[PDB]
Design a protein around this nucleic acid. Structure first.
Ligand SMILES: CN1CN([C@@H]2O[C@H](COP(=O)(O)OP(=O)(O)OP(=O)(O)O)[C@@H](O)[C@H]2O)c2nc(N)[nH]c(=O)c21
Ligand SMILES: Nc1nc2c(ncn2[C@@H]2O[C@H](COP(=O)(O)OP(=O)(O)OP(=O)(O)O)[C@@H](O)[C@H]2O)c(=O)[nH]1
Ligand SMILES: Nc1ccn([C@@H]2O[C@H](COP(=O)(O)OP(=O)(O)OP(=O)(O)O)[C@@H](O)[C@H]2O)c(=O)n1
Ligand SMILES: [Mg+2]
Ligand SMILES: [Mg+2]
Lengths: 734, 148, 736, 284
RNA sequence: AGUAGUAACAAGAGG
RNA sequence: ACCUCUGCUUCUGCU
């Protein structure tokens, strides 16, 4: 009697004039309101109210039908239900003894569908049961707040694709007009439809769980290590304020996460290696010791098809064949001939927006292949010189065109952005310029297409054309856009020198380490370098805190060495990571400044300052170079934002707190070491004490050169202070 | 509003507003600031719901008696450990109270326990106990029109 | 030795032990009795701050309306409402210039929203002033009442299902000569005068705020009716869309995201500074933010933000500010009086305050009533100035941010500059300059500019120090945010939803705090133990082997003695606690699944059970919590639906009132909605669309369902005919 | 990490479980639980509630403790602030007459005698019964029922101090902190000056603070704690060399001071703030 | 009386 | 007297 009982119920209701009035005068639309009509209020103090009600005999509201399904009194004479109707419904008031009764003695259903419906939940336990624990380590680490994924096993659908799918799976006949384009949608539907046939769990719970499962959800969390969802899921277990619990969840990685981590590892290794005396030797060492989730980096590099500049430098070193390309918009980009160079510049979008953006300037040629489409591209500086394109469908040729127009960096696409497009997230975090544009013009190219123009095509027919419509067109096309139809995938043997320059067998320069992106990303999966060349605690913030913590804890030895044998101190290997945080162009001068200042402190007895030494020491670690520049600070690149470390006194980055007697680096204690004359702030000058108008007006720093041995001044030294300086009668060579 | 174009509007009104409108900063030096001032009056008095440091317990070790877990049974067992009763006297008055009533509540209580049977004890609503529990002390509620 | 916990601060920085300064293990303050006193207080103060403005009598309501805008400039530091239109406009223009295309985009999105929003969006509020009853009601009930009374009086554009059409009805309803509603003496039709009706439409009901921490004294809050709420909604959406793209806005970002944004702002600031500049931060708050905001200014802001946009949308958005300019406050529940001599007590109403003899009142309250009398109109108080608590959080935020935006070096060209972050009235201002004198001047420039737009920095609540430490809405920064675990202490307990929801909430709270508020592992373990004990006592679900006596002991003991694998029993079924740190994120039912006697499991998880009260996907596994600070939050939890997913009984007090009839209406409605869902199961997931009646849709569905069932063989040919027969009889019966 | 946590937890469980503040927790939880349930189920009955706790000696044995009795009044509690009146009747060897201001609301009875013997002979001590009318509400009973949360407030702070040192030392400082039993936090004042305590003492002092915040919850405490926090923060800014300034320090002092009215716990907290200020002043 | 604390509770409503 | 009903429901807002 499928349909029998419900139509009979309906009959009875329509026999009541009131109910008939409601059902004949309430639109489906208006049902959305009257569905919520109530005198009942959302409890405002549920904790108190439950403590109150749980003292009562009949605090629970149950379906009327409970009266048919369980006894009125149990074996012990407890009343389980009553006939009192709960306010505003036909539910009845029952005892908590009714719940226990049901659970010991009620009807037994089969639970076969439970694992599948609540898979998202059960998978959590599966990962944990098959998880492996390593040691706990104790240290301070900066946990930086970022947005991370929180639900492993999603299918990367938008809420409207999920809805569409869930409508098909759970309520197919109520779908309405339109149906599913995507094939992802279709194979999920079938799988789920097949998994959940004959399912008797409430469709509400099935839809709820499907929605939780299928849609990617994120959250902003403080997170020090691996950002993958399977690690996020156990953040409470693996990360504490002063500890890491090494752990590997059961199950496979995502190929996406591994690829992403491989790139981060390879970039980290390249950047660390470039600052060693023998980059190639250092890079090979790190390649050979590093693992990603206990998989050797060497094996990943042999088996993994990722084409990226740092990855390829590592592959070359290891004698692995490379496809001299990178990824962009899902398409693989082999550079045939020419080259260019990375330069940042300001750029007004048609959105009406200023934006620093790395722009490649120069002549280049690109073979481009995807899984459905391919093309030949010729490029200048923000110049789409020409794009010859092919594939399976019109669709797939289009989708690559969009990508290439955007890839050009042309003004016409720059100034075709319309509506909401920003380059910083809500949290003020800078986003990828190019990926933003790509996602935009894939949502809607109509402006882009109309803003581009057209071109009259010749009779060398075979060189076809595509119109601002998206239309196939014989005599006209867009600008630089044509249509046509061995060894693009083919991996080549290269050679690599001591400084990581990669060349073919013919000996042409394919890759230089300066072409490796400077972006410090966060790895989706754990990286263990297992290397003497890398701090045990990963990450840029940790380079800072680790280095200073290490100086301090070893200060007694390092001090004696500062006094007796500086040059050996400066060249120590523990300072190399820190060097990677300093802008390349500043390393030598920063070093020269620091060594000079340190020599001055030696020459001018009685002016020892251990904090000043600790603070500047890592900047000593580069072949020096003397100059005229006085520095008021040194720049450090942390996560692509410059922090400035003030030469004189405390800064946000580095400060000594008198009250705690600790040095605080990026907000973290790194422990403590435990006259007015300052010898190690200015090159060639001494600070005596507070300013004195006796010796004339307050000079900037960059106006002190025009003094002479013994001659004094007043200086705006920094952070609002004015001080009395003296140019030294003898200076220090270093 | 639609044709509005700014041109020194804030600057002009800043130039017309008295210097008495300001946020002068006073340097804060904890060496020259005073202690907080506390209120004066009668001395503060205890207001916990139960005694704290001055409490005294009657205890039974490793209780085994019938009804171990039932409060009033445990209570009887604890009471049984004290022999040294004597006629209750008042030795410190609740100045605003009917001290007689408190004496009588205790006597009623003790007796009702000694005589009790079962797991729970409910006391008779004597005049002294009613008083102590504010029985009937709520004013009778009336319409304004009838008492205005 | 006398113990003094405060002495810890001699060694430990205050921020690093800040947790101890939050006494959130005790009950927070509550009001008892009326809020009428607090309502009069805010009405009085709001007028006092604007007292040098211009009075007018409203043509439609007769309300006395004070207008301090473009009034005389402040002459001292007392809180002022003398905001200056041209100054506000300069600031908003400044915001337009700093962010080209921002206004246009936020407007575009708001327009799309206006076209797409369904009337039922207004069901999402909490307690709502219900003008048809002159009493508060749940938002959905208040919406239904307005719709019903509207249609009976001839307004029904809202039948479209579009919010904007309901908004049209609202404005059109004000033309009515006499709006009819029905009161319950049985049932009486009552005709409101045009003036009566408009006053009720412009009403915000008032009550006192309970359970607010950190304050000796109480204050009043307000709830608008349904005529106001739809318009405010769209103004605040527009403002939200703007706030989301301002680097200086603290809304609507929440905890971690807010902290990330603040940290970025400091980082930004310091990068843009020179090494020679001093930098100071004000930990900032404003005096009586809401009382000094002004609807007329909001009107200006809205017109300026929406410049160049279609006039229908400008005028639609301007409605909320106009209504607020013309608002009145209900004065609350009145007062109680007592006669010592006659041992009696009685209730007077707020309405009585118009003309009651003043002899009954203490001097303070007598003075209040005297002051309020000239504002009273048909039982309410005229309140043209101010916005009342939290009504335009986002638009007011836009005003504060606009001042922050002024501080750019290239605008000021002074020896100082500023930036910062603002959320409502709370702010962190970072001022930079060469010398301390520059800082002072910059602070004065910022403060005085704020004054010119009715923002009054609280001198006693705000302080300044060199940049590096600061506080922002109970987030403490000491060269980076530190934890404040005590803020969260109230959330450690039994939530009071049900046995299933509460286990999941309890373990999640522990886990979340380990991640976010530096809840260390040992204390987290102890939190598990403390939670389990409280859950067991609350729900009387002591372990089956224990010898406590409750009303549940005997039935749980039987379940226990009869169970083979006891480790599989849920705690609520007398089972053991499985939780430790590592599995806090695993729903209990999952955790114990493999360890359960198959029969218990099949009962516990029986989908046919009568306990679980499912309703809607969108409100599935959702609880409401009230944090120690701030608005009610929806809380998602992860749990398998079982017989433990039950619903506690409803309040029955209404049975003793004239409003008991409502219970019957609810029961009928629910019965109609339930049967509807037997025909349209998808309606529990998404909301169904249509102008068709509920009955017509169910008839059409039965017929075509019965036909497919027939072909596919799920049903006999006999059954099938009876279905189509029943349908025909329903068709007929529907004609009387 | 679970194994690490349990070792530290055992240290914690000891310090806190044996602390007298934990006695008050259990009294409060038992009394409020019994009063709430009785209030709900027996609205017309003057029902008796024995004040009971159960503990174990360090020497391992179970003991049941009786302190006295509560008599519940009628209890038609509707609003969450609605009052249930009750009588408390509580044993004590304390003679109130030595400190009567402490006992304004109580009528103290003499009800018996208690023996103490030694050698040359013995001594009888009077047994008093502290009797008073009192009241509570559903909101206050609910929070009293939850007073175990006080353990978390103390231990979370203690554990944060252990962890902070552990990060810098790169090892678990739990055992060193609990065992090196060196006096390494200022927690009190004697006539000679500032006294230091071990982490164990800090735990119990912070626990007591938290427990007293719960027993003596008030609006006075709320306002005092929020406003005095700003002054604490200003002092900290000075000690960090961040050159703090105020805009209306006078108004800030008045905002703190108005919250100190009559509550013994807030009065003491105000006094503590003053002692802290003096001690800081002396150190500068 | 007591709770409390800027206004309430110390049962309300109905018969 | 006694009977009946009620224990968040004339009072808990906003992004
Ligand atoms: C327009 N582009 C972009 N591009 C390459 O595109 C690749 C990926 O694009 P991208 O936006 O730079 O991303 P990338 O910096 O790798 O991402 P991340 O933020 O993770 O560092 C890079 O390896 C970059 O060299 C180019 N490479 C060359 N040679 N010439 C070009 O004109 C361009
Ligand atoms: N709209 C709205 N704003 C709120 C609400 N609660 C708090 N706020 C705002 O958020 C601010 C931060 O609150 P907290 O700092 O946590 O508490 P507080 O006691 O007001 O602040 P302190 O002065 O720091 O003690 C408040 O000062 C208000 O400006 C709320 O429920 N609604
Ligand atoms: N529970 C709350 C608390 C605050 N607010 C909003 O937040 C503003 C700032 O709150 P707060 O600083 O606490 O109060 P003020 O109104 O500024 O008054 P004052 O600071 O002088 O006490 C309020 O005006 C109001 O708009 C709110 O809507 N609800
Ligand atoms: Mg404020
Ligand atoms: Mg505020």
């Amino acid at each position: 009697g499928s349909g029998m009982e419900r139509i009979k119920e309906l009959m009875e209701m329509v026999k009541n004039s009131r109910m008939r009035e409601i059902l004949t005068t309430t639109s489906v639309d208006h049902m959305a309101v009257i569905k919520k009509y109530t005198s009942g209020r959302q409890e405002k103090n549920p904790a108190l109210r439950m403590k109150w009600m749980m003292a009562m005999k009949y605090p629970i509201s149950a379906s009327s039908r409970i009266r048919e399904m369980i006894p009125e009194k149990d074996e012990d004479g407890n009343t389980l239900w009553t006939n009192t109707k709960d306010a505003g419904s036909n539910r009845v008031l029952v005892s908590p003894n009714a719940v226990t009764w049901w659970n010991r003695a009620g009807p037994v259903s089969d639970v076969v569908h439970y694992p599948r419906v609540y898979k998202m939940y059960f998978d959590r336990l599966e990962r944990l049961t098959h998880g492996t624990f390593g040691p706990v380590k104790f240290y301070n680490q900066v946990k930086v707040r970022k947005r991370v994924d929180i639900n492993p096993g999603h299918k990367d659908l938008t809420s409207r694709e999920a809805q569409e799918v869930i409508m098909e799976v759970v309520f197919p006949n109520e779908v309405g007009a339109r149906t599913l384009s995507s094939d992802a949608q279709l194979t999920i539907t079938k799988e789920k439809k097949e998994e959940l046939k004959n399912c008797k769990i409430s469709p509400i719970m099935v839809a709820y769980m499907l929605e939780r499962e299928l849609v990617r959800r994120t959250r902003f969390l403080p997170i020090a290590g691996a950002t993958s969802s399977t690690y996020v899921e156990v953040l409470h277990l693996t990360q504490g304020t002063c500890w890491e619990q090494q752990y590997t969840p059961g199950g496979e990685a995502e190929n996406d996460d591994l690829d992403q981590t491989l790139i981060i590892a390879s970039r980290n290794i390249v950047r660390r290696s470039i600052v060693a005396i023998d980059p190639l030797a250092s890079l090979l060492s790190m390649c050979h010791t590093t693992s990603i989730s206990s998989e050797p980096l060497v094996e990943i590099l042999r088996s993994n098809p990722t084409d990226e500049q740092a990855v390829n430098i590592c592959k070359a070193a290891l004698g692995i064949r490379i496809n001299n390309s990178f990824s962009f918009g899902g398409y693989n980009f082999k550079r045939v001939k020419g080259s260019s160079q990375r330069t940042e510049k300001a750029v007004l979008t048609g959105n009406l927006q200023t934006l620093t953006m790395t722009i490649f300037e120069g002549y280049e040629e690109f073979n481009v292949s995807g899984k459905r489409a391919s093309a030949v591209l010729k490029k200048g500086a923000q110049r789409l010189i020409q794009a010859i394109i092919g594939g399976r469908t019109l669709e797939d040729i289009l989708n690559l065109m969009i990508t290439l127009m955007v890839f050009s960096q042309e003004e016409k696409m720059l100034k075709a952005v319309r509506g909401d497009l920003n380059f910083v997230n809500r949290a003020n975090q800078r986003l990828n310029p190019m990926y933003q544009l790509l996602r935009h013009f894939q949502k809607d190219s109509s402006t882009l297409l109309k803003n581009w123009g057209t071109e009259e095509i010749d009779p060398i027919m075979g060189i076809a054309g595509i119109m601002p419509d998206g239309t196939i067109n014989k005599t006209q096309t867009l600008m630089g856009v044509r249509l046509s139809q061995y060894s693009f995938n083919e991996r080549i043997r290269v050679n690599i020198d001591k400084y990581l320059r990669v060349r073919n067998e013919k000996g042409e320069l394919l890759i230089s380490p300066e072409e490796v992106s400077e972006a410090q990303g966060q790895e989706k999966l754990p990286i263990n370098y297992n290397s003497s060349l890398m701090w045990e605690v990963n990450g840029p913030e940790s380079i800072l805190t680790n280095t200073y913590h290490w100086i301090i804890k070893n200060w007694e030895l390092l001090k004696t060495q500062w006094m007796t044998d500086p040059t050996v101190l400066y060249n120590r290997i523990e300072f190399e990571p820190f060097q990677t945080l300093i802008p390349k162009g500043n390393r030598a001068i920063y070093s020269g400044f620091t060594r000079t200042l340190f020599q001055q402190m030696r020459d001018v007895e009685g002016t020892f300052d251990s904090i000043q030494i600790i603070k500047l020491l890592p900047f000593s670690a580069h072949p020096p170079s003397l100059g005229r520049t006085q520095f008021s600070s040194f720049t450090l690149n942390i996560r692509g934002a410059p922090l400035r470390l003030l030469i004189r006194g405390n800064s946000q980055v580095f400060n000594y707190n008198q009250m705690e007697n600790v040095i605080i680096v990026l907000g973290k204690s790194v422990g403590s070491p435990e006259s007015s004359i300052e010898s190690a702030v200015l090159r060639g000058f001494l600070i005596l004490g507070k300013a004195n108008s006796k010796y004339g007006p307050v000079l900037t720093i960059g106006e002190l050169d025009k003094l002479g041995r013994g001659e004094k001044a007043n200086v705006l030294i920094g952070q609002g202070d004015t001080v009395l300086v003296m140019k030294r009668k003898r200076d220090s060579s270093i | 509003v639609s044709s509005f174009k700014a041109n020194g509007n804030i600057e002009a009104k800043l130039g017309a507003m008295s210097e008495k409108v300001n946020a002068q900063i006073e340097s804060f030096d904890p060496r020259t600031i005073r202690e907080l001032e506390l209120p004066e009056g009668k001395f503060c008095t205890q207001r916990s719901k139960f005694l704290l440091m001055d409490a005294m317990k009657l205890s039974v070790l490793n209780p085994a008696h019938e009804g171990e877990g039932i409060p009033m049974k445990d209570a009887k067992a604890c009471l049984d450990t004290f022999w040294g009763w004597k006629k209750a006297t008042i030795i410190k008055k609740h100045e605003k109270g009917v001290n007689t009533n408190y004496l009588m509540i205790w006597e009623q209580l003790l007796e009702s326990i000694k005589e009790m049977e079962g797991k729970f004890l409910n006391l008779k609503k004597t005049n002294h106990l009613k008083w102590g529990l504010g029985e009937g002390q709520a004013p009778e509620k009336m319409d304004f029109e009838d008492c205005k | 030795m006398d113990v003094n916990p405060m002495l810890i601060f001699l060694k430990v920085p205050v921020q690093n032990a800040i947790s101890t300064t939050f006494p959130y293990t005790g009950d927070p303050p509550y009001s008892h009795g009326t809020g009428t006193g607090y309502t009069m207080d805010t009405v009085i103060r709001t007028h006092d701050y604007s007292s040098r403005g211009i009075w007018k009598t409203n043509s439609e309501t007769g309300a006395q309306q004070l207008n301090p805008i473009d009034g005389p400039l402040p002459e001292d530091n007392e809180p002022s409402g003398y905001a200056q239109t041209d100054c506000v406009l300069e600031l908003i223009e400044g915001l337009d210039r700093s962010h080209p295309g921002l206004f246009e985009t936020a407007c575009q999105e708001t327009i799309d929203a206006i076209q797409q929003t369904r009337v039922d969006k207004l069901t999402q509020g909490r307690q709502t002033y219900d003008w048809t009853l002159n009493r508060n009601q749940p938002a959905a009930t208040a919406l239904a009442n307005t719709i019903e009374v509207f249609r009976k009086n001839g307004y029904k554009l809202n039948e479209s299902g579009r919010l904007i059409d309901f908004l049209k009805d609202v404005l059109l309803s004000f033309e009515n000569d006499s709006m009819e509603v029905t009161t319950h003496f049985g049932k009486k039709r009552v005709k409101l005068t045009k003036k009566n009706y408009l006053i009720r439409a412009l009403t915000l009901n008032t009550m006192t705020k309970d359970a607010e921490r950190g304050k000796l004294k109480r204050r009043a809050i307000a709830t608008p009716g349904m005529q106001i709420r739809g318009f405010v909604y769209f103004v605040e959406l527009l403002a939200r869309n703007i706030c989301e793209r301002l680097e200086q806005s603290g809304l609507p970002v929440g905890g971690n995201e807010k902290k990330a944004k603040l940290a970025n702002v400091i980082k930004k600031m310091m990068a843009k500074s020179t090494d020679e500049e001093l930098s100071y931060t004000i930990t900032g708050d404003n005096t009586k933010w809401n009382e000094n905001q002004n609807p007329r200014i909001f009107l200006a802001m809205v017109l300026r933000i929406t410049a160049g946009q279609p006039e229908w949308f400008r005028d639609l958005l301007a409605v909320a500010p106009i209504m607020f300019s013309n608002k009145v406050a209900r004065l609350g529940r009145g007062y109680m009086f007592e006669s010592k001599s006659m041992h009696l007590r009685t209730q007077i109403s707020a309405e009585n305050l118009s003309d009651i003899n003043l002899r009954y009142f203490n001097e303070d309250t007598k003075k209040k009533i005297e002051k309020i009398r000239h504002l009273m109109v048909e039982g309410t108080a005229s309140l043209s100035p101010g916005m009342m608590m939290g009504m335009f959080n986002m638009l007011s935020t836009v005003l504060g941010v606009s001042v922050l935006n002024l501080g750019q070096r290239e605008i000021l060209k002074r020896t100082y500059w500023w930036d910062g972050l603002q959320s409502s009235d709370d702010f962190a201002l970072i001022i930079n300059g060469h010398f301390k004198e520059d800082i002072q001047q910059g602070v004065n420039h910022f403060y005085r500019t704020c004054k010119l737009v009715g923002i009054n920095m609280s001198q006693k609540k705000s302080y300044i120090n060199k940049t590096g430490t600061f506080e922002f809405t109970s987030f403490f920064y000491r060269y980076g945010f530190v934890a404040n675990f005590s803020m969260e202490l109230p959330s450690f307990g039994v939530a009071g939803n049900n046995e299933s929801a509460d286990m999941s909430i309890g373990t999640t709270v522990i886990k979340t705090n380990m991640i976010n508020n530096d809840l260390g592992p040992a204390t987290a373990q102890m939190a598990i133990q403390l939670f389990i004990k409280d859950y067991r006592y609350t729900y009387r679900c002591h372990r089956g082997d224990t010898n406590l006596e409750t009303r549940r002991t005997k039935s749980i003991k039987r379940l226990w003695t009869e169970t083979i694998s006891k480790a599989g029993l849920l705690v609520a079924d007398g089972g053991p606690n499985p939780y430790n740190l590592r599995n806090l994120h695993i729903p209990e039912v999952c955790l114990k699944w493999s360890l359960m006697d198959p029969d218990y499991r099949g009962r516990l998880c029986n989908p046919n059970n009568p306990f679980v009260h499912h309703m809607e996907v969108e409100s599935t596994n959702l609880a409401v919590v009230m944090p120690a600070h701030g608005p009610a939050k929806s809380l998602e939890y992860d749990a398998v639906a079982t017989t433990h997913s039950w619903t506690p009984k409803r309040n029955r007090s209404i049975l003793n009132t004239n409003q008991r009839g409502i219970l019957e209406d609810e029961r009928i409605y629910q019965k109609c909605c339930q049967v509807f869902e037997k025909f349209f199961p998808s309606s529990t997931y998404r909301r169904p669309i249509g102008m068709a009646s509920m009955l017509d849709a169910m008839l059409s569905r039965a017929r075509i369902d019965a036909r497919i069932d027939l072909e596919s063989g799920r049903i006999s040919s006999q059954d099938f005919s009876e279905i189509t027969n029943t349908c025909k009889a329903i068709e007929a019966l529907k004609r009387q | 990490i679970e194994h690490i946590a349990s070792r530290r937890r055992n240290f914690f469980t000891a310090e806190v479980s044996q602390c007298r503040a934990s006695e008050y927790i259990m009294k409060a939880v038992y009394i409020n639980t019994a009063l709430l349930n009785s209030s709900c189920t027996a609205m017309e009955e003057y029902q008796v509630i024995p004040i009971i706790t159960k503990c174990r000696d360090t020497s391992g044995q179970r003991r049941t403790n009786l302190y006295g009795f509560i008599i519940k009044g009628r209890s038609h509690l509707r609003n969450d602030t609605d009052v249930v009146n009750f009588i408390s009747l509580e044993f004590s060897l304390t003679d109130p007459r030595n400190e009567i201001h402490k006992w304004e609301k109580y009528c103290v009875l003499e009800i018996g005698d208690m023996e103490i013997r030694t050698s040359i002979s013995t001594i009888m001590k009077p047994v008093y019964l502290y009797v008073r009318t009192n009241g509570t509400s559903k909101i206050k009973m609910k929070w009293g029922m939850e007073m175990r949360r006080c353990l978390l407030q103390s231990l979370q702070q203690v554990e944060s101090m252990i962890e902070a040192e552990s990060a810098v030392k790169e090892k678990d400082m739990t055992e060193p902190f609990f065992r090196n039993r060196e006096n390494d936090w200022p927690i009190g004042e004697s006539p000679q000056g500032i006294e230091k305590g071990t982490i164990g003492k800090v735990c119990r002092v912070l626990l007591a603070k938290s427990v007293f915040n719960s027993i003596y919850a008030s609006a006075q405490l709320e306002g005092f704690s929020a406003e005095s926090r700003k002054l604490l923060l200003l002092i900290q800014a000075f000690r960090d060399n961040l050159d703090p300034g105020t805009f209306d320090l006078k108004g800030l002092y008045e905002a703190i001071e108005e919250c100190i009215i009559n509550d013994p716990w807030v009065l003491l907290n105000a006094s503590w703030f003053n002692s802290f200020l003096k001690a800081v002043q002396l150190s500068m």
